[PDB]
Amino acid sequence: MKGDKKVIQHLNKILGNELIAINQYFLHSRMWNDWGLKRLGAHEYHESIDEMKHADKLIERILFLEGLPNLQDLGKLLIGENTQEMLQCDLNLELKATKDLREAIVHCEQVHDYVSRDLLKDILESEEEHIDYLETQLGLIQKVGLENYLQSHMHE
Amino acid sequence: MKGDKKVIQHLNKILGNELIAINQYFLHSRMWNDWGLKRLGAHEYHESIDEMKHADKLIERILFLEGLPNLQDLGKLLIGENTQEMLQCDLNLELKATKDLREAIVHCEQVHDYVSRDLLKDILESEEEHIDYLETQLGLIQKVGLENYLQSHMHE
Amino acid sequence: MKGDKKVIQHLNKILGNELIAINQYFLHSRMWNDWGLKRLGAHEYHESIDEMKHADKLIERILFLEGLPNLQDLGKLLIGENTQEMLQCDLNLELKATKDLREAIVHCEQVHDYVSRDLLKDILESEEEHIDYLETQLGLIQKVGLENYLQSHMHE
Amino acid sequence: MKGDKKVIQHLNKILGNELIAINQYFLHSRMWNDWGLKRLGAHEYHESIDEMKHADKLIERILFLEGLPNLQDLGKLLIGENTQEMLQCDLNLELKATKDLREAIVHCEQVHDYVSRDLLKDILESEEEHIDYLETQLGLIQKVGLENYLQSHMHE
Amino acid sequence: MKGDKKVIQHLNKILGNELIAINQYFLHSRMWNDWGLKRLGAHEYHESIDEMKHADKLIERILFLEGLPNLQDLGKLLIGENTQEMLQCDLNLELKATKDLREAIVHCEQVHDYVSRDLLKDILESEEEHIDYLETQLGLIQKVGLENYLQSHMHE
Amino acid sequence: MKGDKKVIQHLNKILGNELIAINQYFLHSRMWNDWGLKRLGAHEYHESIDEMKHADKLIERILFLEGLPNLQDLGKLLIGENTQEMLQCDLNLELKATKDLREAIVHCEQVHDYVSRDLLKDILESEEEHIDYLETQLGLIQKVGLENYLQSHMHE
Amino acid sequence: MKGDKKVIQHLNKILGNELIAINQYFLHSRMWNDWGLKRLGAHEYHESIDEMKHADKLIERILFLEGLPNLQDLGKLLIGENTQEMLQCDLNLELKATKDLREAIVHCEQVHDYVSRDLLKDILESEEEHIDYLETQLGLIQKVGLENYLQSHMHE
Numbered sequence A, B, C, D, E, F, G: 001m002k003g004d005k006k007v008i009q010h011l012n013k014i015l016g017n018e019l020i021a022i023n024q025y026f027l028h029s030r031m032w033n034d035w036g037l038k039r040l041g042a043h044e045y046h047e048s049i050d051e052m053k054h055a056d057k058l059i060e061r062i063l064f065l066e067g068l069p070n071l072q073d074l075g076k077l078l079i080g081e082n083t084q085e086m087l088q089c090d091l092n093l094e095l096k097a098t099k100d101l102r103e104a105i106v107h108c109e110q111v112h113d114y115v116s117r118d119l120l121k122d123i124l125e126s127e128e129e130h131i132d133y134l135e136t137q138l139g140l141i142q143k144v145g146l147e148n149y150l151q152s153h154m155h156e
């Protein structure tokens, strides 16, 4: 089906963000696992898988709209050097992702691509859940202290 | 069955306390969940449900006695701004509630409304169990430290 | 996540309508049960539970958006003195509630809070189902007569 | 297999009656459900499905006989404005359908299309069962009164 | 519940498209079955059922909004004389249907009938899935050749 | 455990190849699915998953050896424009991948990193199986013809 | 099958390291159990069992090669006086063991005893997994503090 060219551009921008998130979350997961913080590693693994599923749906939508999905361009990963920074790097990426999702939904609504809007809204709901998770973890570090926070994330 | 007017007034006073407790505990529960203290959130949710069941039985009793249940007037919620304050606000409310239950039981006894007395005694038993829980939590905070106490209430 | 202040105000306005509905439907349910109209009592109970679940989701969303949920201010209950009035009071409340929901959705859309919109849309779907039920009940009273209508709601 | 041209015209006339009946019963069903008369709504839905199955078999036979099934021409639906009129409208349509079935069977017999006759006889048995149902409902309205009749059709 | 007059007109236009689709897809299905192309027959049958379910929901929504569903007016069916034409006829109908859905969604949005919009968005998702299927089939005919394409659709 | 710096560099080069392969195979899979060649799409999907698992093991090994896995640098994807080109592009990437694996194993052996060698040997066995598959597909296209080959890959 | 004499000498050296490891890990396990750190005790017990199984395979290989397995000479156990030291003593033993495994593999390769090499490679894989575990435990002590680390290892 011949899609709106600018919708396809927005879908590729969202996909670009997902590709960053896949790799950033996967690396964070395996760093946490290496450090013995296996509950964080498993949770971050599932975040990465969730972003892979989002990327799959975006690729499929772009192709249906007769666009070319961009899996070639990879923006800057935000990694960081300890648990607090890794969480804040994830949160910075998510806030950028949700900004782009909202701008994409505006445009889908304006050109009447209501199915693309529904897909992006579903993705945004997942990203807002991730934001809730991250903000909560950063708050917990403050409430229980870093030592206890990390302790509580050693065992799955 | 025509009830004693003052019994019905006592029952509506107890009901008023329950309506405060339902909302205060439900809000406390959701604040704790939002902060990632899900064991506290879950326990406080069950306390709110318990008060909902008490309120149901009082409403049913008032109607049987041919009175009008007062679900319109809501007294002051005691919310507080951190875990210790929230627990103490709950405890303050409970101690007011048990005082009111005792005065109502005295009056039921005097006018021979033994079934209303039995209902209020059952509610009083539940409220004293709540008081036991709350006093114990406040004492645990002192014994294990706030950070450990919160850590232990992160996961269900 | 820092929410739009007016979104939060709208969500609290919706929450305020739910708190009225919880109590109005609960009291109606227990009145109908006391009168032996247990099918009405049970259906109205489930309506009250529905509104409790809506209020829960609203409270959770307001807290995520870093607002304060208002569980303190309870507006006017619309009770009524017989079955037809009780149903009409529920319907008047629902029509106010759906008006407020639509206005809230407009503002969510305007500020790009698409997740709050989706939550409100889901609540609106539930409220329109309640309106369908209420309008149908009122029409059935006209078609079968009040005595038959009440007869048909004695038993579950 | 090359069918008799006039047999095919008869099958298309029967099919045309079925297409009217599908829509008329389906709309009646959904009207009754909307009014809270869900036992009538469910029964009328099953009448509509029955006519759909008849239409399928007619379409399949016409194609086997190398004719063109006519799904384009829709005759006048008989809707009516209350339960008694809706039942009478269905019955009027059914009596027209059974007259047309009888004439089609005569013709099938004359040209020795005994398999088409057997199909039409099966459909005629179904339609006489519908007529029995409709005549019985109209008679019940007279015997129990309209308010009781409708009351008995509120719940499935 | 009193619906918006122009929403009801849009819903009846959508329903009119569905009534065309139901019959067009049903006839196409039975033509393919008659020709021994049973996998196409089965798939097209399920498409027809899908449109029947959409029409049911539209009819129910129109009646809830106190409008009259139009099951009387049947537009032009697009049939076609061979497999390629039949698929292109379905695709032409679907492209008209999605245009009309998008215009109806615009109008529901403007009058704040967000529940009608959600229903129409769900129907639109289904129709874009049909378009995906149709465009894919027409493309497969080009890649594998007509004779192989038909061969692959003989057996369910 | 402090690894050999040049081993870690080899492992990061292998990982780099895997990241290309993940995206190339995933896009190919979704292109084939979009075109209705679902058997090719499913097989290529599982190839993508295989490379994801290889990348996981490489990341875990690099981190164990106290290196930094490179998920930032993405080399050129080889995307075909038709099935035969897509298969040849996969094959060209695989032949580069196995050359790099062999050179990495030579170096692992020279510095006695026998566990890293064992990991790479396992990956190489997988890649030779992929090469076997790809060479076999390209051969089949020649033996059965492209139209038949594509026909055989329509259905899962 | 008469083996290479220096292979057998290497296998006996590896066996000697395993006999030290068996006893050192078993004593550490029972020390941790005595101290109430039963999760550490259980994990170290399973490490001891692992080394017992390695020793068994070495004994079997040496006998097959017509050598005499040396179970008589026991080198110095590295015990240590607290958890951190005990883990470090285990890590120091493991690093000597893997050095010895690497030299043994070099010699097996030179004299073409590829089966002995494969056995040692499998043992080396196990020992590198132990090193991972130990390094991670030492890292966790730094990140969560010793008191939390030991707390998390009290219960299995």
Ligand code: HEM
Pocket: A019, A022, A023, A026, A049, A052, A053, A055, A056, A071, F019, F022, F023, F026, F049, F052, F053, F055, F056, F059
């Ligand atoms: C374009 C980028 C990627 C896409 C579209 C993608 C897509 C997917 C999908 C759809 C799944 C199946 C998830 C499920 O249904 O449970 C999956 C699984 C997985 N992915 Fe990815 N992925 C991508 C990149 C990566 C990368 C870079 C890695 C690691 C470096 C990775 C590691 C994994 C793993 C380990 C699994 C689970 C496999 C299993 O054991 O079943 N993925 N991926």
Ligand code: HEM
Pocket: B019, B022, B023, B026, B049, B052, B053, B055, B056, B071, C019, C022, C023, C026, C049, C052, C053, C055, C056
């Ligand atoms: C007049 C005030 C209320 C009364 C009499 C009442 C009564 C009840 C009762 C009898 C139940 C069934 C519990 C059970 O038996 O398992 C219930 C459930 C529940 N209530 Fe309330 N309630 C009140 C107010 C509220 C409020 C204000 C909220 C939220 C703000 C709320 C949230 C809930 C929830 C989430 C459930 C569980 C529903 C489910 O999933 O089953 N209630 N309530």
Ligand code: HEM
Pocket: D019, D022, D023, D026, D049, D052, D053, D055, D056, D071, E019, E022, E023, E026, E049, E052, E053, E055, E056, E059
């Ligand atoms: C040419 C006209 C039609 C034909 C030939 C037709 C045929 C059929 C058939 C063969 C079935 C399967 C019944 C079974 O064996 O269980 C069916 C189901 C159904 N039809 Fe139709 N139909 C027609 C028109 C319609 C219309 C106009 C509507 C709505 C206005 C409708 C609504 C339904 C529904 C709701 C179902 C059941 C779907 C389910 O089971 O979930 N049909 N139809």
Ligand code: HEM
Pocket: G022, G023, G026, G049, G052, G053, G055, G056, G059
């Ligand atoms: C301090 C000396 C040792 C101690 C205290 C010890 C202790 C144990 C214990 C408690 C078990 C588990 C028994 C069971 O399954 O119920 C076990 C199993 C075993 N041990 Fe030892 N052991 C020692 C030395 C050795 C040595 C020197 C060897 C071989 C050279 C060996 C080989 C084995 C084997 C093969 C098993 C069976 C484990 C399995 O496959 O499940 N052990 N040992």
Ligand SMILES: O=C1NC(=O)c2c(NCCCc3cc(O)cc(Cl)c3)cccc21
Pocket: A027, A031, A077, A078, A079, A080, A081, A082, F063, F067, F068, F069, F070, F071, F072, F073
């Ligand atoms: O692809 C990428 N791989 C990376 O490692 C990486 C980056 N690393 C910065 C240091 C992270 C770190 C800190 C630490 O204390 C321990 C460890 Cl293991 C790692 C930055 C951008 C992109 C990439």
Ligand SMILES: O=C1NC(=O)c2c(NCCCc3cc(O)cc(Cl)c3)cccc21
Pocket: B063, B067, B068, B069, B070, B071, B072, B073, C027, C031, C077, C078, C079, C080, C081, C082
């Ligand atoms: O909280 C509230 N409790 C109430 O009763 C109530 C109200 N009652 C109005 C009369 C309803 C009634 C009529 C009847 O015949 C029998 C019964 Cl039991 C009750 C109005 C506003 C608010 C409230």
Ligand SMILES: O=C1NC(=O)c2c(NCCCc3cc(O)cc(Cl)c3)cccc21
Pocket: B027, B031, B077, B078, B079, B080, B081, B082, C063, C067, C068, C069, C070, C071, C072, C073
């Ligand atoms: O209905 C009510 N809703 C309320 O919030 C509330 C009150 N809140 C005072 C501050 C509570 C708070 C502190 C905090 O540190 C974080 C959060 Cl989320 C909330 C007081 C009386 C009645 C009500």
Ligand SMILES: O=C1NC(=O)c2c(NCCCc3cc(O)cc(Cl)c3)cccc21
Pocket: D063, D067, D068, D069, D070, D071, D072, D073, E027, E031, E077, E078, E079, E080, E081, E082
């Ligand atoms: O209701 C309708 N019934 C119809 O047949 C029909 C139409 N037929 C067009 C001829 C296509 C055909 C070609 C063929 O080779 C075999 C067959 Cl059976 C049919 C056109 C519009 C509307 C209708």
Ligand SMILES: [K+]
Pocket: A148, A151, B148, B151, G148, G151
């Ligand atoms: K602790």
